[PDB]
Design a protein around this ligand. Structure first.
Ligand code: FMN
Ligand code: BCE
Ligand code: ORO
Length: 361
């Protein structure tokens, strides 16, 4: 496993031979079979959400939408895996092309639209390795399951409720994904009244599961929220005792300076141009929740510094996806190695010590 080789030769050649969706599909395939190219120190261990995480670097939702490559992803060095988004019924998503690379920006735009094998398929896939996962979790490698809703559903809350009932028993944590920019009307569920109603139902359904099968519940939010939106989300989270937040999904904004020819494609923008917008959203949400609500920080993480900035801003854990598509699997070890070195350099005894450090200076 060599960073230079992947960054300079393998990935650019892959990007030059296949379209983005094809590259994604082949990657899931390769990862699922364990055809892949760092020893986690105690400094990187985090205890949150009722679990030990051997390192704080996870794979973000969207890469493994259907739970096909979980074990290969742990082998890649991720401290936790999130699969999904999964919808109740199977659905195809948007017509192709629906994924676009912006190499000049180290960015991606996608409009997949919740292409999903559906709950039943994912349920059986996870059941086939349920005890293996139980041991992985105990060993500090938890599993998250990200829930979406069907395009033609009349009752959004019931979609998420069904997700809780079916995949909740198989997950260490669940994500109520109300932040995809690619499903019409979905982001409106972030509004105060809609969110409270939705999350009340979700939490009731979760509380009804047997104790060993009872996951933490997190809400994944957009980077495009107004100050009022963020205030309201913070209020509802505290009112209902939501276990955590995932911050953030992709942006519908197109920051000044984007160079990629494909910058004006419809969809969610990810990668470097999203990075600081996400970090600032983490920072705001941490403050609004008084540091009492665990945050998983996501968006434009490609290095140790990127990870630590989100951690200092208030994230207990981080995730990446887009960086993997540019630098390949070696980015995981790179992020962890750089993060460890930076923690030492900045006087932190571990990740835990650095969580929210910016707010205390
Ligand atoms: C191709 C693609 C598909 C994605 N699909 C999902 C999804 O199904 N559910 C979800 O919550 N986030 C999804 N995401 C968003 C990521 O989980 C993450 O929040 C975002 O991409 C920012 O992280 P990054 O810059 O490291 O990619 C997707 C992102 C991309 C790149
Ligand atoms: C949307 C998406 O996943 C991509 C694009 N564009 C993409 O390139 N993904 C990807 C992710 C991982 C890998 C990879 C490369 C080597 C070994 C295992 C996996 C290759 C490609
Ligand atoms: O299109 C999707 O499936 C999707 C894309 C994205 O960026 N975020 C998300 O939650 N879903």
């Amino acid at each position: 496993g060599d960073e230079r080789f992947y960054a300079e030769h393998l990935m650019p050649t892959l990007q030059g031979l296949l379209d983005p969706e094809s590259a994604h599909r082949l990657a899931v395939r390769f990862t699922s079979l364990g055809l892949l190219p760092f020893q986690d120190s105690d400094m990187l261990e985090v205890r949150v959400l009722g679990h030990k995480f051997r390192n704080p670097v996870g794979i973000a939702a969207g890469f493994d939408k259907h739970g096909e490559a979980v074990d290969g992803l742990y082998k890649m060095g991720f401290g936790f895996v999130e699969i999904g988004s999964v919808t109740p019924k199977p659905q195809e998503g948007n017509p192709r092309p629906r994924v676009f690379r912006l190499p000049e920006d180290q960015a991606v735009i996608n409009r997949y639209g919740f292409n999903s094998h559906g709950l039943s398929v994912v349920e059986h896939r996870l059941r086939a390795r349920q005890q293996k996962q139980a041991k992985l979790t105990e060993d500090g490698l938890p599993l998250g399951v990200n829930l979406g809703k069907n395009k033609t559903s009349v009752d959004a809350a019931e979609d998420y409720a069904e997700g809780v009932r079916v995949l909740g028993p198989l997950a260490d944590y669940l994500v109520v994904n109300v932040s995809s920019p690619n499903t019409a009307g979905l982001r409106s569920l972030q509004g105060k009244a809609e969110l409270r109603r939705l999350l009340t139902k979700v939490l009731q359904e979760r509380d009804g599961l047997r104790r060993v099968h009872r996951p933490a519940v997190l809400v994944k939010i957009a980077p495009d929220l107004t100050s009022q939106d963020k205030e309201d989300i913070a209020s509802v989270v505290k009112e209902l005792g939501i276990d955590g937040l995932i911050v953030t999904n992709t942006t519908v904004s197109r920051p000044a300076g984007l160079q990629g020819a494909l910058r004006s494609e419809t969809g969610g923008l990810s990668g470097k141009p999203l990075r600081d917008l996400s970090t600032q959203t983490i920072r705001e949400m941490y403050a609004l929740t008084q540091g009492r609500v665990p945050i998983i920080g996501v968006g434009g993480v490609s290095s140790g510094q990127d990870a630590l900035e989100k951690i200092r801003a208030g994230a207990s854990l981080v995730q990446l996806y887009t960086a993997l598509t540019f630098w390949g699997p070696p980015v995981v070890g790179k992020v962890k190695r750089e993060l460890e070195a930076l923690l030492k350099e900045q006087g932190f005894g571990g990740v835990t010590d650095a969580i929210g450090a910016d707010h205390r200076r």
